[PDB]
Design a protein around this ligand. Sequence first.
Ligand SMILES: *[C@@H]1O[C@H](CO)[C@@H](O[C@@H]2O[C@H](CO)[C@@H](O[C@@H]3O[C@H](CO)[C@@H](O)[C@H](O)[C@@H]3O)[C@H](O)[C@H]2NC(C)=O)[C@H](O)[C@H]1NC(C)=O
Ligand SMILES: *[C@@H]1O[C@H](CO)[C@@H](O[C@@H]2O[C@H](CO)[C@@H](O)[C@H](O)[C@H]2NC(C)=O)[C@H](O)[C@H]1NC(C)=O
Ligand SMILES: *[C@@H]1O[C@H](CO)[C@@H](O[C@@H]2O[C@H](CO)[C@@H](O)[C@H](O)[C@H]2NC(C)=O)[C@H](O)[C@H]1NC(C)=O
Ligand SMILES: *[C@@H]1O[C@H](CO)[C@@H](O)[C@H](O)[C@H]1NC(C)=O
Ligand SMILES: *[C@@H]1O[C@H](CO)[C@@H](O)[C@H](O)[C@H]1NC(C)=O
Ligand SMILES: *[C@@H]1O[C@H](CO)[C@@H](O)[C@H](O)[C@H]1NC(C)=O
Lengths: 365, 375
Amino acid sequence: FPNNIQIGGLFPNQQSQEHAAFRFALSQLTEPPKLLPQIDIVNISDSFEMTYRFCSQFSKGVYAIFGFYERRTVNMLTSFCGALHVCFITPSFPVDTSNQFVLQLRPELQEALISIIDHYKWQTFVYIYDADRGLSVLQRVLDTAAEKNWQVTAVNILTTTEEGYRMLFQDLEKKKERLVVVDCESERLNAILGQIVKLEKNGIGYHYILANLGFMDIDLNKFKESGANVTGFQLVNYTDTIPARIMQQWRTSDSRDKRPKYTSALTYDGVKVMAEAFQSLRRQRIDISRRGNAGDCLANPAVPWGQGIDIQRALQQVRFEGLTGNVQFNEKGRRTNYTLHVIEMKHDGIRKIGYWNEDDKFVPA
Amino acid sequence: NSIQIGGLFPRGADQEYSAFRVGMVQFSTSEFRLTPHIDNLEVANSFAVTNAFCSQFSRGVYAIFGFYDKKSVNTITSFCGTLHVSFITPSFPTDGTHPFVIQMRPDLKGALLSLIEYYQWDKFAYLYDSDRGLSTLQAVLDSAAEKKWQVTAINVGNINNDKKDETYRSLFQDLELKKERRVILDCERDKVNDIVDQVITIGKHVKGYHYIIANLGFTDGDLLKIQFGGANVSGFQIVDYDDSLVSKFIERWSTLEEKEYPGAHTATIKYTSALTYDAVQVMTEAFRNLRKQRIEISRRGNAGDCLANPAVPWGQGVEIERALKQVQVEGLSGNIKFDQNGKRINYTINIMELKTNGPRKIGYWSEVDKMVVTL
Ligand SMILES: *[C@@H]1O[C@H](CO)[C@@H](O[C@@H]2O[C@H](CO)[C@@H](O[C@@H]3O[C@H](CO)[C@@H](O)[C@H](O)[C@@H]3O)[C@H](O)[C@H]2NC(C)=O)[C@H](O)[C@H]1NC(C)=O
Ligand SMILES: *[C@@H]1O[C@H](CO)[C@@H](O[C@@H]2O[C@H](CO)[C@@H](O)[C@H](O)[C@H]2NC(C)=O)[C@H](O)[C@H]1NC(C)=O
Ligand SMILES: *[C@@H]1O[C@H](CO)[C@@H](O[C@@H]2O[C@H](CO)[C@@H](O)[C@H](O)[C@H]2NC(C)=O)[C@H](O)[C@H]1NC(C)=O
Ligand SMILES: *[C@@H]1O[C@H](CO)[C@@H](O)[C@H](O)[C@H]1NC(C)=O
Ligand SMILES: *[C@@H]1O[C@H](CO)[C@@H](O)[C@H](O)[C@H]1NC(C)=O
Ligand SMILES: *[C@@H]1O[C@H](CO)[C@@H](O)[C@H](O)[C@H]1NC(C)=O
């Protein structure tokens, strides 16, 4: 197949860890195919700007797309991907309703969170959710709350102010036992942590849970002294042989030119996913060709690209032990058969209580 | 003076287009009129919405009436903000302050939370559909945190029609263990019917139970099933049938050729259609106000394409938006006034119960005053 297999990219910021990781991982690409980054810097929230960029990449004839999406523009993007039969790789938050052309390289924490809450004798607690797509995980909880009969006092951070937090925590500490779940983005978690450090983070029966796939990246130093419990999840193990080699090579190269966030790790893995699919396509000798018509995305009717279907299947079929874990994909187009590491942070302790698996239910270790 | 207009209508909405045509004939005049270009599509396909919006924009439409769903809000609002093209909807109001979007549908959280307090509720379920957002769900949960309520929130919007029967019964079996005698059915007409037709089967429409139908159309459904069971049923209605304009409109509505105006023969009118009719009135009033004020609105040339780098909005759109927001008229729904953001204000939401004789109004609700009681 031709080595000019142009690939697109939609990013919010020119300089960031995620972008740098995506740029670097391509260097390791020694496969006969040559994948072009073809980056476009686009604001995520604005759907119009994104539709412009996505149609531009359509004009260029891009075979596959990698990028991020937020709550406002998840639907729009998803819709175009199921109409033009064009695949879209992403490490962004996963969604319940989606096409098969959207590959989400971020396993869902909703199931594991339920298991962890179940294991601990949690009778009532407070839930803190960011509107940035966290709602899908809220319903699950509210649906399981009825089945299993615990009380959940949800509070939204997006529409909560300092006075809101003050009142919530004041009403919370009137209870003898204080349990809290904090679903948040990468950056919102830091600000909320700063908010709780000011007060109400004493550690007097306070038990926090952090529904973030990456718990080592977060700077919980202030929590190692106050004597408070916190539980979290990790998806990336740096000690293992493949992660150790990848991290060593990458950090050595970068220095010759810290620990990556989970978003950056997934970004790096996505390059491997696309490369593996295209390598297997070249090996399988499948006829892939891009017509120079480059029809406008707003073509009535927009004929699906004939080959774009098989690409999807190929991108779905790939499988390998990547940095984060073992990469696989369900029929719906979502990470399957993976492992998460439950991790409690004591005053001086980083203890791997156990691991969650799709087949198992929080088997301890 | 014809002014170009655009119209979007969801696939499978016959009454609303009929009310659109009726409003055209009613408010059309020799000196002023409207030229609508119509498109019918699946509003939950952002691709189709984008295509239709861009085609109409290329056709030089000054304003676009239409509907939208939770999966097409952001596309539409972004396009309107970028291109400074207005949008008039009876669909659910945005959870924000998005510009160049006029909203004909009043909010509901205030009336809902006042009503739940006129009955001294502490432990109630909240069945909700995954549509029109979760704004009212969040409002209810927040007021629960403040007032120490006990809310059991359940989603019913992801239920397959083929297997609908099994799930609903198990749902109510779960609710029974908690003695949930009170429920809020926050859903559209169709699912409210599909649920009321499964409360009956299991005999939960009896003296002990209370239901609140969190919708602006209370009569729209079929309440003749539960009038007599003995259970309370409360709800909200914006279209007051004891009004003058409403009665005259009904006179013109019932005497309509269903061969031409589907859904028109019936005596009932759904709030979406009512707001569509009022929307035609709104557009005519604003555009005629522009004509009287001599504001210059005309497309000298052609709007190339929706997707154009850089985007170059035409600067008379601000005038159109201001005119649309600066209109004060009576209509089927009631008094129509807007903000600088587009949300409606100074409106009355009539409250209703269900009695063996039939629905009867007991009060109303206005943002300024309170929940108000007459009967
Ligand atoms: C990506 O999407 C849009 C546009 O690129 C940005 O949202 C827009 O953000 C601006 C600045 O924050 C908002 O303007 C301000 O809005 C507030 C209300 O939120 C108002 O009080 C101010 O007077 C001012 O008008 C604008 O409303 C908002 N638009 C929408 C549709 O949300 C977003 O910030 C962009 N993100 C990045 C990283 O560029
Ligand atoms: C689920 O993932 C696990 C990875 O832990 C897979 O286990 C590996 O499977 C491959 C393929 O058969 C073997 O070559 C490896 O030796 C297995 N390793 C371990 C540690 O089990 C497992 O096969 C996956 N399940 C499915 C259905 O694909
Ligand atoms: C169904 O409606 C009736 C009438 O509104 C309710 O009966 C009233 O409820 C109050 C509340 O304590 C009781 O004192 C009486 O039974 C009735 N009084 C008045 C003034 O109406 C009944 O409670 C409703 N059912 C439910 C489940 O709320
Ligand atoms: C907090 O951690 C301690 C161990 O330090 C343990 O008893 C339990 O996990 C938690 N106890 C609380 C929060 O009272
Ligand atoms: C990482 O893997 C090593 C062995 O490969 C294991 O000893 C260690 O506990 C793992 N770390 C986590 C956090 O699971
Ligand atoms: C606004 O509301 C009042 C009642 O509060 C009602 O007469 C009518 O709808 C409006 N009247 C005004 C704005 O004077």
